[PDB]
Specification:
23% strand, GNAT_dom, 218 residues, transferase, acyltransferase, 7 strands, alpha+beta, 36% helix, Aminopeptidase, aralkylamine N-acetyltransferase, EC 2.3.1.87, seven-stranded mixed sheet
């Protein structure tokens, strides 16, 4: 049944299910992952999975569970601290052995250098939406938007004042725009070129831009 969907904060007993959901329905089809053939469904990826698990452990992610306990969708959210040493990401960047993964990491890193949301809003932590995923069986039910609404409700509960997402896809961008998020930084995939003038990411329509977007919630 496509109804009686429940929303809950993701706890450890569910990590396996959630990671499986991501392997099966999300990772391979995300615009940038797809552009560089990062992986295929069910196969997963050690780095993607490590990152998702570390995110889950922030205890601010939301899942939509169906009547029979299937993961209908998730919002994997993480906490960004203003006091985290930047160096971190440099080392991480120069540590990766997966060429394809490194390209994505680098684009996200580089764009994030162009703004400082901690200073702009005078906050020491930011609630980051990292993955927004809905299982194909459950599309057309408005779950993606609900997952973000629920994420904002939890963020407010935990005393956050600013939410952020680095949205790589057009559907997620439209969802968060509809909920009041504003673009702070953006770049067209057709404009992000290697030294020889060829695109680093050749991305399938309708995905055209990476947008770093944010919302003041309190």
């Amino acid at each position: 049944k496509l109804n009686n969907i429940r929303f809950e904060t993701i706890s450890s007993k569910y990590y396996d299910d959630v990671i499986e959901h991501l392997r099966q329905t999300f990772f391979a089809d995300e615009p940038l992952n797809k552009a560089v053939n990062l992986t295929r469904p069910g196969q997963g990826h050690p780095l993607l999975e490590q990152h998702s698990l570390s995110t889950l452990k922030d205890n601010v992610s939301i899942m939509a569970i169906s009547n029979d306990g299937d993961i209908a969708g998730v919002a994997l959210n993480g906490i960004l601290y203003g006091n985290t040493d930047i160096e971190k990401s440099r080392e991480k960047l120069n540590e990766i052995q997966d060429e394809s993964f490194k390209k994505i990491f680098k684009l996200l890193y580089e764009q994030n250098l162009k703004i400082n949301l901690f200073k702009q809003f005078d906050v020491d932590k930011i609630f980051e939406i990292r993955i927004l995923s809905v299982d194909s069986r459950f599309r057309g039910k408005g779950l993606a938007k609900k997952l973000i609404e629920k994420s904002e409700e939890l963020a407010l509960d935990r005393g956050f004042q600013v939410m952020k997402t680095d949205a790589t896809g057009a559907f997620s961008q439209r969802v968060v725009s509809s909920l009041g998020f504003i673009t702070k930084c953006e770049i067209n995939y057709t404009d992000y070129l290697d030294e020889n003038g060829e695109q680093i990411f050749v991305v399938d329509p309708p995905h055209e831009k990476l947008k770093i977007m944010c919302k003041v919630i309190n």
